[PDB]
Enzyme design. Structure first.
Site: not given
Lengths: 438, 402, 124, 402, 124
Positions: A49, A52-53, A122, A129
């Site tokens: 994940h 993906e960022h 990030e 999140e």
């Protein structure tokens, strides 16, 4: 009759699969990867994940800003998602902007910077999140459902990963993940809409030819999950709506019971009080629920993975004094898949599904998603003729035999969120998985 | 889409190579023609209720045997009723639409128990998004009536069965009905519509009571469920350049986890806010809107100032790069709109019901930097700015502050 | 028995000239001897209401019809407990004995019976 | 009323010949000084709750033994707490006010269970009148903040215990407190206030955050509970002539079962509507309002046109008779305001706290027809008209129509 | 007995130097042998709550204190049914044994008792 899905390979083992539609003017090209969170261990859980960022944070050529501009100038958009077993990166564009989009995707996958400065930036975004998924109740429910059903196993882990890992993910482990997993024999380049197959194969030879091949190439959609009957209760009296999921271990993509499980799921079906037609649906559960105001909605599901699945139902209700009735009537409808279903329900569900499986594919992105999913789970796109034949092969005897081995008197995984005081304890729910009269 | 006529009804169809057909009846019956507030929403929700040949119950049970689906929505211009089914089942769907237009029993119990409750849930779901509310409020300020009528049925003004029956008497007539068939053989559809819709009243063209008038102003919808702000500029002469300008100014990102390279997207940096510029052509007037939603009223206020600045800056100078980026983003938006069945149906519906020929995505005009900057200049120098604030309205900007 | 049944059988009789010629006069006498009109009732006020279908039909009555039915039930209850009969305008005249409820219950039952049938459909 | 000072607190009293006294504490703490929306309403409702010396329960039981009564209200300028009792009970009431200002325990349970629910019922009762709502909406449009703050607490902006405790720390101070005694011996009150309010903080003068700014506009409040329309005109230089103009234009009838001879009253003939012109002086700005309520939106619209015409006609010519009638109606209004204990208290409260010397009813200026017509002319030609519509707002007038 | 009574008598003892010197050490051993801390309770969690006054006091707890009390009751119930004791951080340490509820109940009772007195006032 839809146009034929063309399929080619490169030398490295990258599959190219395309389905042209000369009636549309847009195209969805992208890369489906047979890899996801399930490929992480406990220490690097969250890496897929995280990547993906970073994929959109700049490459060896284009910086973050240049990347933004290049896509803006293309005119369409790029999108990505990481699941437990699958990663997708696609680009929707105009017909003649397809070579640009393939080139950008090839760049962000092969040649991403993963600069320590961007990792660190990030690391906060992703940390935030963790505290905002909390609002998406269906996702909260399904993530707890996987965590408990596959307790302490790779399918049970979340995609975001623990807070601890987010703080310790390095560019090294990111690079290692994508080097081990994003190999050519696990990847499919998919084009749907206004794409020429032969053009797409040339673009693949231009951009994806220097992809690593894995040492031991297994076929696409190659995987032992041990389901735990269990429950998670997340009671919150301040929430007005209860969200409940109940599931049993279901079927994998390649199970012989894959279609039987879909037909059984269609016999229970979905319901939503806000849709006008839902009060008139044929499903028995739908009639009970609507007549008695037991729920705002329910949605049957049959999720598949390479080596297991979850089959069950997701319910939402404001009726907090009749949650017991809602759960009771739902599980008594499941019992009837074992005891009572006949050709009447089975033929009705088959009718509804024969159309449903075709209806779903109504845009280039849906077509691309269908080609990509089928190629990465089954190794081939299954033609509608074959699908029609497999559905037709499902009899009432098959449904009853499947339900008797999968549902009847079996352990469930159960998640409740919200005002669930009325949800009884595990035993009383699990006792509804059988009928004493039968 | 080969436009034709079958027994007085305009029929447009495009054959394809798919097992899935979409048949849509587009009715000239949207909210700008609504006799009483909310009636076009109610009439949309009254579609596929009990007809004389076939009950709502029987229709839904048979639709499940075909595995068909049903989609309905109301706009300011149209009511659209769409069915999606397998190609071969076309005759059933044509006859179903015929029953709805000719033989709907508008029964009071259906209104009280079925139609109005569903209409109410529809609206509550839409309003959960404060940006929806802000853009609806903006149309109400800008146009007052016609285009300023609410699209949706509201609690404060109840629609009666006599209201809906009267409106349906006007709308359900050959003059207000267009049939649009995606992946339908055009010759076959004309034959079926010609037999099924033959006994439908001819009726007369429904008209907007009164001419479209433009007004400026402010709306302050105090909610507790999120914050948004629309800055609209009413347009007296709708021009296609505003599409290019909407796409240029942009606002949404074209990439995951990004802000975007669009001026309005760059106005949100350092804030958890989103922004979207939109242009609404309604033939005789238009609306150019910039909507900003967020959780912080302070941040929304901050972005709103940057947004108006961005529009002024655009009025000054656009680069050639930026003008080309606008052409590309705009052609793409046009293409995807003609693909999406909901919007597709209404586009051809407009061509059939009015006479506004569709602009094919391949024929979308390229606007020079001169033409774009000129369009933005007119908007920055508007005599009638509208501002609709939703949420903590005491903390959101006012028109005179912007 | 369902109201649907009663209404359909009655319609068969009313169609047949012979049958109607002999049944209609009997039915009119029956109603006169029944004597519900002497308590100010209309025939439909007597129909059993403690049923899901009938409760739904009653909820669909227009408010005016509903308020008037409430008054006739209360008035008849007061005649019953007093051991009196209606006089004057309280007596229901034959032209006032309207079937105000029959259309509502026939619609409720139509759907109920269609639902039962469709629950038993067999794809051919 | 003999103005004096007792231990730093301004005290005004007027002895009389009656057995009943009214003691009122006037606080500079009305809604224009509010820090958070609704706090001045909440602080008013928190008066005579539990203090450290005496519980709310004990206070009410003892007040019943004196047969006294308690009256509190909030304005845009003040919070007024009035007690009415027998003359001889004065020392008890002075000490009670001292306990409230010095020793109120602002407890969270009182806020949740006692104070906020009562504040909410207060507002719901006021809003039952659509004219109240319309005039409140008009102030909000005209001033935005300060005078544009809501007077009353609303659900959408929850006041917290910390909000109320902070505001009370500012307001409950010698600099913001005036004591007004009707039918109280002035020498006796000064002695008692001087002992009881000696240990009250000095504090500082509470101020309006920001200067009063005037704005024009429209407010459209959809209710289902009756219809009203206010036409307000913000006034930048408050002048006493607007009192005469308000009384001239009039609106209410001066005798039963009649319409009235006032220009606004004559505007209602043939309609079941009422009208009232009002002028609000707030020192640094003012508001001239004409409110029309009725059950028919069509009739309200009709009267609103006549109302605006009446004001224009006044700007043209007033006769000598009409100017004298305005002097008479205005002197009377002034006299009755100085008599009513509610308004009386705030009038001297404004003289004590602010410094605005009261205008005695006998000293009310007579305005010539020239001066009246000039004032009306200045209003009909205002740059910033406010219109607040309440009820079926789609059917009520807009500012640009008037 | 009322909490008010208990609190007042305790304060009399704590005032007297002699009395406190002999009572406070006893009370500390009593609490140690009582063993409610070994189920993770605070002393106030044990007070009988099925009375109007106590239900009102509990409703006035701040939400966080209220949510934490619910958790301690559920946790203690689970120790009770399992026949286990708390370990580690679940054991209530003496510094965590705070009288979170006593101020609320003393205010509720103060009003209740004042109301009783004032119901019996006699104008002199």
């Amino acid at each position: 009759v839809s146009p034929k899905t063309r399929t080619s390979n490169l030398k490295n083992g990258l599959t190219i699969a395309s389905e042209s539609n000369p009636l549309v003017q847009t195209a969805t090209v992208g890369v489906w990867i047979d890899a996801g969170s399930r490929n992480e261990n406990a220490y690097n859980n969250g890496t897929a994940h995280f990547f993906e960022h970073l994929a959109f944070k700049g490459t060896d050529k284009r910086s973050q800003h240049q990347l933004e501009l290049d896509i803006e100038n293309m005119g369409g958009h790029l999108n990505a998602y990481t699941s437990r077993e699958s990663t997708v990166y696609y680009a929707k564009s105009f017909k003649d902007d397809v070579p640009k989009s393939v080139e950008i995707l090839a760049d962000i996958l092969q040649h991403s910077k993963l600069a320590e400065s961007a990792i660190d930036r990030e690391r906060e975004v992703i940390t935030r999140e963790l505290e905002e998924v909390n609002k998406q109740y269906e996702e909260v429910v399904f993530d707890h459902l996987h965590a408990t059903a596959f307790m302490n196993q790779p399918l049970g882990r979340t995609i975001l990963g623990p807070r601890e890992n987010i703080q310790t993910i390095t560019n090294t482990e990111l690079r290692k993940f994508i080097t081990e997993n994003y190999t050519a024999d696990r990847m499919v380049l998919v084009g749907a809409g206004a794409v020429d197959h032969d053009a797409l194969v040339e673009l693949a030879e231009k951009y994806f030819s220097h992809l690593p091949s894995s040492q031991s190439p297994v076929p696409l959609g190659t995987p032992i999950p041990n389901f735990v009957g269990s429950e998670v209760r997340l009671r919150d009296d301040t929430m007005p709506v209860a969200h409940i999921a109940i599931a049993v271990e279901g079927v994998s993509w390649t199970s012989e019971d894959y279609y039987t499980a879909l037909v059984a799921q269609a016999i229970i079906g979905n319901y939503d009080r806000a849709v006008g037609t839902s009060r008139h649906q044929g499903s028995r559960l739908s009639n009970i629920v609507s007549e008695n105001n037991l729920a705002n909605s329910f949605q049957s599901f049959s999720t598949s993975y390479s080596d297991t699945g979850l089959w069950g139902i997701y319910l939402t209700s404001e009726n907090t004094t009749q949650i017991d009735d809602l759960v009771h009537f739902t599980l008594k409808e499941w019992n009837r898949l074992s005891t009572s279903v006949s050709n009447l329900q089975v033929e009705r569900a088959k009718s509804q599904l024969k159309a449903g499986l075709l209806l779903s594919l109504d845009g280039t992105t849906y077509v691309a998603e269908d080609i990509g999913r089928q190629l990465t789970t089954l190794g081939r796109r299954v033609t509608p003729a074959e699908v029609e034949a497999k559905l037709e092969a499902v009899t009432e005897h098959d449904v009853r035999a499947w339900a008797q081995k999968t549902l009847y008197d079996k352990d469930i995984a159960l998640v409740g969120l919200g005002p669930i005081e009325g949800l009884y304890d595990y035993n009383r729910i699990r006792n509804d998985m059988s009928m004493m009269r039968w | 889409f080969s436009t034709a006529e079958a027994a007085g009804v305009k029929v447009a169809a495009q054959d394809g190579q798919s097992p899935i057909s979409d048949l849509s009846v587009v009715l000239r019956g949207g909210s700008r023609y609504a006799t009483v507030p909310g009636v076009s929403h109610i009439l949309e929700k009254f579609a596929f209720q009990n007809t004389v040949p076939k009950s709502a119950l029987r229709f839904v049970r048979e639709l499940e045997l075909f595995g068909g689906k049903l989609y309905t929505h109301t706009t300011r211009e149209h009511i659209v009723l769409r069915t999606q089914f397998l190609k071969q089942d076309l005759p059933y769907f044509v006859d179903a639409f015929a029953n709805v237009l000719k033989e709907t029993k508008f029964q009071q119990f259906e209104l009280t128990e079925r139609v109005a409750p569903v209409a109410e849930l529809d609206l509550l779901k839409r309003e959960s998004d404060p940006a929806f509310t802000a853009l609806e409020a903006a149309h109400e300020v800008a146009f007052r009536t016609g285009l300023g009528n609410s699209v949706y049925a509201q609690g404060y003004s109840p629609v009666t069965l006599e209201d809906v029956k009267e409106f349906a008497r006007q709308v359900y007539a050959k003059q207000n009905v267009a049939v649009v068939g995606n992946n339908v053989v055009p010759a076959d559809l004309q034959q079926l519509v010609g037999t099924a819709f033959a006994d439908l009243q001819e009726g007369s063209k429904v008209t907007q009571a009164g001419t479209t008038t433009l007004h400026g102003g402010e709306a302050r919808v105090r909610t507790s469920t999120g914050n948004a702000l629309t800055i609209a500029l009413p347009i007296a002469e709708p021009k296609p350049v505003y599409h290019a300008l909407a796409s240029f100014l942009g606002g949404p990102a074209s990439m995951p986890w990004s802000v975007g390279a669009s001026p309005l997207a760059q106005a949100t940096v350092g804030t958890h806010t989103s922004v979207k510029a939109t242009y609404h052509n309604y033939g005789d007037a238009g609306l150019f809107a910039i909507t900003i939603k967020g959780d912080s009223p302070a941040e929304i206020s901050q972005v709103a100032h940057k947004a108006v600045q961005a529009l002024k800056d655009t009025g000054a100078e656009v680069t050639e790069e930026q003008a080309a980026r606008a052409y590309a983003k705009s052609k793409f938006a046009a293409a995807e709109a003609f693909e999406n069945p909901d919007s597709s149906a209404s586009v051809i519906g407009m061509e059939l019901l009015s006479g506004v020929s569709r602009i094919a995505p391949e024929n979308v005009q390229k606007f020079t930097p001169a033409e774009l900057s000129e369009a933005a200049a007119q908007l920055s120098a508007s005599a009638k700015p509208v501002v609709a604030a939703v949420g903590q309205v005491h903390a959101l900007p006012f028109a005179d502050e912007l | 028995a369902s109201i649907t049944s009663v209404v359909k059988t009655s319609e068969l009789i009313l169609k047949s000239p012979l049958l109607s010629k002999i049944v209609v006069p009997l039915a009119k006498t029956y109603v006169k001897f029944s004597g519900y009109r002497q308590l100010g009732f209309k025939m439909n006020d007597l129909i059993i209401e403690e049923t899901p279908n009938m409760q739904l039909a009653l909820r669909r009555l227009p408010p005016t019809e509903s308020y008037d039915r409430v008054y006739r039930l209360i008035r008849a209850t007061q005649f019953s407990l007093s051991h009196k009969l209606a006089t004057g305008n309280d007596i229901t005249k034959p032209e006032e004995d309207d079937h105000y409820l029959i259309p509502y219950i026939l619609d409720v039952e139509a759907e109920a019976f269609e639902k039962d049938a469709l629950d038993n459909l067999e794809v051919v």
